[PDB]
Design a protein around this motif. Structure first.
Motif, short mmCIF file in Angstrom:
data_model
loop_
_atom_site.label_atom_id
_atom_site.label_comp_id
_atom_site.label_asym_id
_atom_site.label_seq_id
_atom_site.Cartn_x
_atom_site.Cartn_y
_atom_site.Cartn_z
N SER B 153 -4.88 -1.76 18.61
CA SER B 153 -3.40 -1.47 17.75
C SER B 153 -3.63 -0.48 16.68
O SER B 153 -2.59 0.09 16.24
CB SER B 153 -2.91 -2.77 17.07
N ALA B 154 -4.79 -0.12 15.98
CA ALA B 154 -5.17 1.09 15.20
C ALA B 154 -4.42 2.22 15.50
O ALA B 154 -4.35 2.67 16.74
CB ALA B 154 -6.54 1.12 14.97
N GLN B 155 -3.78 2.99 14.56
CA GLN B 155 -3.22 4.30 14.66
C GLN B 155 -3.74 5.22 13.85
O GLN B 155 -3.49 6.51 14.25
CB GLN B 155 -1.60 4.15 14.42
N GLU B 156 -4.33 4.99 12.63
CA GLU B 156 -4.81 6.07 11.88
C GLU B 156 -6.38 5.64 11.16
O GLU B 156 -6.41 4.38 10.83
CB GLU B 156 -3.90 6.41 10.81
N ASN B 157 -7.04 6.48 11.31
CA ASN B 157 -8.35 6.40 10.81
C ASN B 157 -8.72 7.84 9.96
O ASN B 157 -9.52 8.64 10.87
CB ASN B 157 -9.48 5.67 11.53
N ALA B 241 8.42 6.33 7.73
CA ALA B 241 7.79 5.31 7.18
C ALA B 241 6.80 4.75 7.85
O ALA B 241 6.35 5.09 9.23
CB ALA B 241 9.03 4.28 7.63
N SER B 242 5.63 4.66 7.00
CA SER B 242 4.45 4.00 7.51
C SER B 242 3.92 2.60 7.05
O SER B 242 4.24 2.25 5.80
CB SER B 242 3.56 5.17 6.97
N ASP B 243 3.31 1.85 7.95
CA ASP B 243 2.69 0.68 7.42
C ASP B 243 1.26 0.72 7.29
O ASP B 243 0.65 -0.40 6.77
CB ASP B 243 3.00 -0.26 8.49
N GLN B 244 0.73 1.73 6.93
CA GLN B 244 -0.84 1.94 6.82
C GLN B 244 -1.26 1.75 5.57
O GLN B 244 -0.60 2.17 4.67
CB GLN B 244 -1.40 3.46 7.39
N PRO B 245 -2.23 0.94 5.32
CA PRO B 245 -2.82 0.46 4.12
C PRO B 245 -3.60 1.18 3.25
O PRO B 245 -4.20 2.17 3.77
CB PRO B 245 -3.82 -0.52 4.47
N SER B 264 -10.07 -5.34 16.17
CA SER B 264 -9.66 -5.41 14.75
C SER B 264 -10.40 -4.01 14.25
O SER B 264 -10.20 -3.84 12.88
CB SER B 264 -10.54 -6.46 14.20
N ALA B 265 -10.90 -3.13 15.09
CA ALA B 265 -11.43 -1.90 14.22
C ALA B 265 -10.34 -1.16 13.81
O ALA B 265 -9.11 -0.99 14.06
CB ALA B 265 -12.18 -1.16 15.45
N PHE B 266 -11.00 -0.33 12.65
CA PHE B 266 -10.18 0.53 11.88
C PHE B 266 -8.91 -0.30 11.18
O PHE B 266 -7.90 0.37 11.01
CB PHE B 266 -9.60 1.68 12.80
N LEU B 267 -8.83 -1.74 11.11
CA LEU B 267 -7.81 -2.05 10.43
C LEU B 267 -8.26 -3.15 9.28
O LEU B 267 -9.29 -3.77 9.46
CB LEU B 267 -7.04 -3.06 11.25
N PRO B 268 -7.92 -2.62 7.97
CA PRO B 268 -8.39 -3.62 6.88
C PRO B 268 -7.51 -4.79 6.76
O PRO B 268 -6.55 -4.66 6.62
CB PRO B 268 -8.13 -2.64 5.74
N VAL B 269 -8.32 -6.00 6.96
CA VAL B 269 -7.56 -7.35 6.69
C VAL B 269 -7.33 -7.54 5.22
O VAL B 269 -7.42 -8.77 4.76
CB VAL B 269 -8.30 -8.37 7.37
#
Lengths: 231, 395, 214
Positions: B153-157, B241-245, B264-269
């Motif tokens: 689901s990651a979209q940005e790194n 609008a962005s949901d990126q941490p 779960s890669a490239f997603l910070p929990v």
């Protein structure tokens, strides 16, 4: 550091229940995406998946053995087990435990597999279905000599005779000597006992420069013999 | 005489451009829902509208993000974000096979192509999470008529120092020209997105704010150069609008085909819920892109302008302004000498200015506007349309 | 069930050559197919999953392809260490009901090599018990077909001998053979000369290693 270890090889009497355990080290049996399964191989034959167990407690089984198969998992001890009941000679096989990369997807009442392959296997344990009892082997030296010398190479070995059932482990110098070693398939004798030879060829100019211990282990009878092979 | 009730003839028409209410999640990065799968925490897209023309650009890579994820003895950059194509019944699937697969479901067969792909992708449960909120987003390719499921689901790194100035997986959402026909679909996209969500850009039109009977300019906007509508649509997508941490542990998970580590890669929990610079007015003459973060509530008729949103198609333009909207509504409100609070129409006499109505020179509809009347609302700061103080208590 | 059929049964090729192994499904299985390599006495090892995804750590010379019902494993340049049985395995249905093909044995071609022959008399420890075993060793020969004949006092023996052959060696691709002539203690001390005669393509004439008790 993932390693799988099946319990030891041995006998099961006809109609009784075969019991095996796999001990997982370097990893946890509580690992999403991975199922722990048993696969078996009759001597000289192909591979047959038996069934698996999942850490949550669910288990799939080969539909042609389902009624005889029970798997289980111990999350505390990091082990999983297999129970195959009412065994016949057709169940004589090498039994592998294996980690299975598993992933299925379901919609509208039907599931479809994305992954179900076996990425890490144990070493295999030979289970022999038989009524006979165990007998440990005698270990005789195959001494090096002129009759055992051809060119610049000399030969010596160990005769592992009159044992049941298979297998036997033969190493040399506790595993330190591997080059030049030939351990032959055992033959079944008229007595119903197996017999095996393990030989090592060394350069004949180095015969008396090293000592050669063959280490023989027959786990079904817990026979452990070390035999020095002297010129 | 004049009604004292306020009336906005644009209310229904403008509902689909209320991205906070209709989409309700991030646009550029959509990670608006949480999900637990086997005691691990995930973030997944949840916007209810499709995002036309969005894909993931992998920097320093020619591989398309619609290629399956790269596992085993290949590097991460050799693959994309899509499901491994191991099973023809899962991903990817052509429209033709989608149609065959669900030919016997009457409700499925009533869905449009995009909603059919979304429903196919989102309906899949993983055999071990049958009670989980985790459902995969999808990309429907309108040119190839093909539905791709996204494995992660990651979209940005683009953040880690290793993503700053070649052999590392760095990526970002974008409207690359390669993605023009692609539709980015979260699990929640409405099956009636065509009625309820943006798609086509609005020609001869610019977004405005309805202020007591007339559509008015949005006072607070940010001007950006833009050569064409596509560039303006891309700019406002970058601003929307962005949901990126360790990268090496992430690469080992891909090599080992580890489900938890890959997904779960490239997603910070946090969660935009649709709020952002989602809208833009494009001046086609002056080559300017005016982006803003305030919901628009009406359209101004202007032959030099195109109204676009971050969700809208990069280049599709609907040119037919609804010229009859004011005349039809004035007649609709007459059924309630009570004349509605609407001071713009293409029929001059239907307004009844105390003065002479003024024609809008750039109105393709030849609209006339009555500015010589008492106004009971105004635009405060941050583009906030507020009732004037004299009538605040009265309303 | 879905049946997997592998072809050919055995494959004999030279190092450096391209090996193509076939696996057919009785029924279309998309790409839910894995490949394994099993060396003698060892467990199988994963090579490929998803028909064409090479597992981590597998050499690049292994590759797989195919879809539906037709699949191939290719070793682009066969190495002498690639001697093994190779298995395919489908896993299309869920809940899993995997099955394997019957395997393809890949053997390595090499030049003819004559065996080195050695004879081992019975050990004195064995002779304390009632049995004497005579061992004749043929090591490092190619091809696999060889014949040993036990001659006790120029009299050819039968029914009192057994033999077995090692699998192909990983480096030199040769075979070794071991034969055991088993007599009673009484029968053994009645005769003196004990010989194994070996015939092989690489042997110009049959070679005979022998000994006399004492």
């Amino acid at each position: 550091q993932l390693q799988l270890q099946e319990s030891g090889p041995g006998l099961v009497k006809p109609s009784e229940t075969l019991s095996l355990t796999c001990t997982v080290s370097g990893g946890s049996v509580s690992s999403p995406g991975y199922y722990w399964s048993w696969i078996r191989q009759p001597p000289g034959q192909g591979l047959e998946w038996i069934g698996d167990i999942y850490y949550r407690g669910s288990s799939n089984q080969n539909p042609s053995l389902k009624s005889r198969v029970t798997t289980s998992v111990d999350t505390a001890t990091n082990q999983f087990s297999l129970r195959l009941s009412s065994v016949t000679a057709a169940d004589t096989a090498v039994y592998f435990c294996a980690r299975s990369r598993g992933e299925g997807y379901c919609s509208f009442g039907t599931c479809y597999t994305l992954f179900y392959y076996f990425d890490y296997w144990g070493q295999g344990t030979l289970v022999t279905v038989s009524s006979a009892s165990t007998k440990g082997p005698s270990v005789f030296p195959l001494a090096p000599s002129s009759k055992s010398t051809s060119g610049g190479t000399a030969a010596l070995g160990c005769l592992v005779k009159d044992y049941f059932p298979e297998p036997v482990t033969v190493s040399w110098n506790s595993g330190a000597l591997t080059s030049g070693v030939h351990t032959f398939p055992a033959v079944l004798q008229s007595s119903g006992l197996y017999s095996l030879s393990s030989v090592v060829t060394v350069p004949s100019s180095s015969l008396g420069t090293q000592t050669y211990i063959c280490n023989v282990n027959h786990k079904p009878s817990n026979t452990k013999v070390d035999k020095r092979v002297e010129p | 005489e004049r009604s004292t009730r306020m009336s906005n003839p644009w209310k229904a028409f403008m509902e689909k451009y209320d991205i906070e209410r209709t989409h309700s999640s991030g646009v550029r990065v959509d990670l608006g829902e949480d999900a637990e799968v086997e005691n691990a925490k995930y973030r997944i897209p949840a916007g209810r509208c499709p995002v036309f023309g969005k894909g993931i650009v992998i920097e320093n890579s020619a591989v398309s993000f619609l290629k399956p994820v790269a596992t085993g003895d290949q590097r991460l950059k050799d693959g994309g974000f899509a499901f491994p194509n191991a099973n023809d019944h899962i991903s990817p699937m052509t429209l033709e096979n989608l149609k065959a697969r669900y030919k016997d479901n009457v409700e499925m067969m009533k869905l449009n192509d995009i909603a059919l792909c979304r429903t196919h992708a989102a309906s899949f449960v993983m055999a071990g999470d049958q009670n989980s909120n985790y459902r995969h987003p999808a990309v429907y390719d309108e040119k190839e008529k093909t539905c791709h499921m996204l494995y992660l689901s990651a979209q940005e790194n683009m953040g880690p120092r290793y993503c700053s100035p070649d052999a590392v997986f760095c990526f970002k959402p974008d409207k690359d020209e390669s993605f023009e026909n692609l539709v980015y679909l979260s699990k929640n996209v409405r099956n009636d997105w065509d009625k309820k969500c943006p798609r086509k850009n609005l020609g001869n039109a610019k977004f405005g704010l309805w202020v007591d009977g007339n559509c008015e300019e949005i006072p607070y906007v940010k001007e950006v150069e833009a050569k064409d509508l596509r560039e303006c649509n891309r700019i406002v997508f970058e601003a929307s609008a962005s949901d990126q941490p360790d990268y090496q542990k992430i690469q080992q998970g891909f090599r080992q085909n580890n489900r938890e580590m890959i997904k779960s890669a490239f997603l910070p929990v946090f969660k935009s819920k649709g709020r952002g610079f989602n809208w833009a007015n494009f001046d086609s003459v002056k080559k300017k892109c005016y982006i803003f973060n305030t919901k628009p509530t009406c359209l101004i008729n202007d032959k030099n302008f195109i109204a676009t949103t971050a969700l809208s198609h990069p280049r599709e333009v609907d040119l037919e302004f609804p010229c009859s909207i004011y005349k039809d509504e004035i007649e609709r409100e007459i059924k309630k000498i009570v004349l509605p609070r609407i001071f713009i129409s293409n029929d001059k006499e239907s307004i009844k200015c105390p003065c002479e109505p003024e024609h809008i020179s750039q109105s393709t509809c030849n609209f006339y506007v009555c500015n010589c009347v008492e106004k009971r609302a105004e635009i405060k700061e941050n583009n906030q349309v507020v009732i004037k103080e004299e009538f605040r208590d009265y309303y | 069930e879905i049946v997997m059929t592998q072809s050919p049964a055995t494959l004999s090729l030279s190092p450096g050559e391209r090996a193509t192994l076939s696996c057919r499904a009785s029924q279309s299985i998309s790409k839910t197919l894995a490949w394994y390599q099993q060396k003698p006495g060892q467990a199988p090892r994963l090579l490929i999953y998803s028909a064409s995804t090479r597992a981590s750590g597998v050499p690049a010379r292994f590759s797989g392809s195919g879809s539906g019902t037709e699949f191939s494993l290719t070793i682009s340049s066969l190495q002498s260490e690639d001697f093994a049985v190779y298995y395919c395995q489908q896993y299309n249905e869920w809940p899993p009901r995997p099955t394997f093909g019957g395997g393809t044995k890949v053997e390595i071609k090499r030049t003819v090599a004559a065996p080195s022959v050695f004879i081992f008399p019975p050990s004195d420890e064995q002779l304390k018990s009632g049995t004497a075993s005579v061992v004749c060793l043929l090591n490092n020969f190619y091809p696999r077909e060889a014949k040993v004949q036990w001659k006790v006092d120029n009299a050819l023996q039968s029914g009192n001998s057994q033999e077995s052959v090692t699998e192909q060696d990983s480096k030199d691709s040769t075979y070794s053979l071991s034969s055991t002539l088993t007599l009673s203690k009484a029968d053994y001390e009645k005769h003196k000369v004990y010989a194994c005669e070996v015939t092989h393509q690489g042997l110009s004439s049959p070679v005979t290693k022998s000994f006399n008790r004492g």
